[PDB]
Amino acid sequence: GGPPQQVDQQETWRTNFYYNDVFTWSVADAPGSILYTVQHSPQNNPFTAVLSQMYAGWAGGMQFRFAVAGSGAFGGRVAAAVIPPGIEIGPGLEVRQFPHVVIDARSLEPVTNTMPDLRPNMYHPTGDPGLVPTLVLAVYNALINPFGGSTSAIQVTVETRPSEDFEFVMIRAP
Amino acid sequence: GGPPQQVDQQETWRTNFYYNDVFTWSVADAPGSILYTVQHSPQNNPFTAVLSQMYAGWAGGMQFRFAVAGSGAFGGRVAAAVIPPGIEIGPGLEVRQFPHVVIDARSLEPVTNTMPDLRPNMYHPTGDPGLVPTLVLAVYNALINPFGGSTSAIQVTVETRPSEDFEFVMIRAP
Amino acid sequence: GGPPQQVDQQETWRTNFYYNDVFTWSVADAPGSILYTVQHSPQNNPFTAVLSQMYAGWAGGMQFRFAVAGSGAFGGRVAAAVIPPGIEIGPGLEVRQFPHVVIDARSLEPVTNTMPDLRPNMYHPTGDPGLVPTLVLAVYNALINPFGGSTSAIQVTVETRPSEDFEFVMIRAP
Amino acid sequence: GGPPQQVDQQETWRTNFYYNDVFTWSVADAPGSILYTVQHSPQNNPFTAVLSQMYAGWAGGMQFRFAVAGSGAFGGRVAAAVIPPGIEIGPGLEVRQFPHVVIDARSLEPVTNTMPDLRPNMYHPTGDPGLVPTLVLAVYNALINPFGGSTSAIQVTVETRPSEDFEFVMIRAP
Amino acid sequence: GGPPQQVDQQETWRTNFYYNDVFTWSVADAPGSILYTVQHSPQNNPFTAVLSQMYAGWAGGMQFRFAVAGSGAFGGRVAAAVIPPGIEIGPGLEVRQFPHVVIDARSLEPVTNTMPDLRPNMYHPTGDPGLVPTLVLAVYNALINPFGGSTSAIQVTVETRPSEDFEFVMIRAP
Numbered sequence A, B, C, D, E: 001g002g003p004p005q006q007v008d009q010q011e012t013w014r015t016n017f018y019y020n021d022v023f024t025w026s027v028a029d030a031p032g033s034i035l036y037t038v039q040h041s042p043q044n045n046p047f048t049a050v051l052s053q054m055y056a057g058w059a060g061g062m063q064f065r066f067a068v069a070g071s072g073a074f075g076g077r078v079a080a081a082v083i084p085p086g087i088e089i090g091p092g093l094e095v096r097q098f099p100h101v102v103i104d105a106r107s108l109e110p111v112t113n114t115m116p117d118l119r120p121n122m123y124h125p126t127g128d129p130g131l132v133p134t135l136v137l138a139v140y141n142a143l144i145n146p147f148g149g150s151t152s153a154i155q156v157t158v159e160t161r162p163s164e165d166f167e168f169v170m171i172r173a174p
Helices: A046-054 B046-054 C046-054 D046-054 E046-054
Strands: A018-024 A034-039 A055-059 A062-069 A075-083 A100-104 A111-115 A134-144 A155-162 A167-171 B018-024 B034-039 B055-059 B062-069 B075-083 B100-104 B111-115 B134-144 B155-162 B167-171 C018-024 C034-039 C055-059 C062-069 C075-083 C100-104 C111-115 C134-144 C155-162 C167-171 D018-024 D034-039 D055-059 D062-069 D075-083 D100-104 D111-115 D134-144 D155-162 D167-171 E018-024 E034-039 E055-059 E062-069 E075-083 E100-104 E111-115 E134-144 E155-162 E167-171
Touching (some): A018 A034, A034 A155, A046 A055, A046 A167, A062 A075, A062 A100, A062 B134, A075 A111, B018 B034, B034 B155, B046 D046, B062 B075, B062 B100, B062 C075, B100 B111, C018 C034, C046 C167, C062 C075, C075 C111, D018 D034, D034 D155, D046 D055, D046 D167, D062 D100, E018 E034, E046 E055, E046 E167, E062 E100, E100 E111
Antiparallel strands (some): A018 A155, A055 A167, A062 A155, A075 A134, B018 B155, B034 B134, B062 B111, B062 B155, B075 B100, C018 C155, C034 C134, C062 C111, C062 C155, C075 C100, D055 D167, D062 D111, D062 D155, D075 D100, D075 D134, E034 E134, E055 E167, E062 E111, E062 E155, E075 E100
16 A cells, blocks of 8 residues: 555544434334444545545545434434444344444434444555445434324434544545 | 734623624424525624724634524524635535534523634725625524424524634724 | 721622522513613622621622523523613613623523622712612523413522622721 | 723824814913813714723823914914813913913924823713813913914814823723 | 845835925815825836836835925924725815824924835735725815915925835836
């Protein structure tokens, strides 16, 4: 591999969180189900996406932040774990024994989970990255609404940020 | 330009927040809509407004503070970003990839956003300021009321303050 | 004037808050109305009242503390400002551009506002104090109850305390 | 009272003289008469006037400068004294035994008289200032024109400036 | 912008005053009228004019000197202020509250007024300078001739000099 090419962190991007995706959390979800399966790719942050268009190859982790738009009178948690590569993702993947964080439905402050680059190589090529970690937001205790009515489908907004070790390795035609 | 003319910060004004405007947040708002579009002008703080009557020309940023008058059983967030000048403001302006802050509906403490003076020049003339930043309070996750009733139109009060770099440059007839 | 005569602060009184008055906050209040207009007098703390019976003349500020007995599912704020003497108090007194504090309806911790002695003289005589500041608790965003029912008239309890600069000047017949 | 709120003198205003009033000096004036009776108020300098609109209460003196638009072939002087408050102003007020300055009719350079804040209190309220000094420009030796003709009514222009101790004490609605 | 290109002041030009314009002062002028409205341009000093032919772009102020050719038996003053750009120049422009200097009709020594470069940019282009200050010589107390006769139209000669901060930025075809 080559030298790092996104050094000098203080550059707005990689120091601030930007929107990645939004997923809905339902009351009728079974408490072991899987929502928001995402893969370690540079197509999560848009500035990271356009510099991955610029560069050939990337390395380093990505910092994920979850903001829940739910009322204070809600219950149930979400479990977020960084699944190792090589482990099959699907039904029966029990998430709660991985190193995980707990995200409340009535959480005022956003919960941040660091997703490192668990890779056998130095870098992931842009055309074919190879073995990459997977971030899984499995439910930990289902949503409970003690009211009854139309409000049963609150949603969580995922915010993303490159970490301190994220950097591109080789430049190419943008 | 000339020297700064509102040095020695500790002067009550510019160290305390004062009311600027109030806007309403509705349940039926689409979650990408725009509320409270404001422009970087000295006609936001009243003491700043009367010294802009006193002086000719101004420079430096302004500190914005938002206080949400909503119940603890509300959901949904607000996104506040400082839009650069030169960028058109309207429908389709996607705010969530700008450097932004997240304001909860059930936030106990007020959320403060610093709006810097992004200017090509040294100062903005009072008659014609030129290129100025724009503060946009776009919605991030719509309001959800799990009750049903007359309460669907809570409102947010904007408080304003000159920053540490705000200062007037030239004096004129007040 | 004479020397200070309530030095050595650590004396229980002036270091602890004691009850002064209680006022009600209604849902149907207009959001610019005025509740709890109080005047800078020693007849706010009872120990201060009986030493004002003891002494002739007083100086120094008073520390005001507000405890709101409201539910966590309430909205709306209260604005507390120390109005300067010489300024007329009534309808149309816009409070939000004075140096103020914001008190939530669902505030867990009491909000404390320091009310200084803004006086032209050294001391205020007990018989006629002269120009004194006025503490005004104007509403900032009206009360919103998303339930509907009998609960619309929550109340706030004012607690008072002499400040660090409060002291009596001359002794007389108690 | 409160802290000073117009510290850091070097601010153009209070370091430069600005026009206040103009009064005429006639040949036929009796040599003990009184022209230009002014009172110690912030409505003498316009920047001081608009910050007195901004603030509530003021303290400190004001620096007065007189520029006489008279020929070099004129005679007679003007006497400028700062009359203490409590002293009645009218006919019979003999000015020449107060601490005074002498202003010539043919004076090339402007004559500056410092008018201090002779006050019993800490500050003067904006609505009612109380006891204030009075600047009286009494004549010392009447105008003599050795020519004879239409030129007998030369005029003096008063210029004003806040002094080093002038400062506002409390802020209010501008 | 580029580096300064008229450094090393001691070069005769910019250290000595040279003639710019001459204007007449009449007895029948109203005492608020405007004479000699000039604009901040390099076409005021002739050496500055030919190096502005040499160079492309300029910055820095200009030092203005006024020599009045009037008798010692004349009265009335002239007021010279540097009007900020953005302020409209015409009838009703009250000059006496700008930072100004007072020029006597019988002044032996010339009165010098420094006219700084109040600009939003780094430099003024030669083809289009943009926002520039304006020097206005408004009358302060009208001319009075106590004689009566043909002498009522004395004139003032303006002398100009580049200041210490005046310098050109970019060279072009002279």
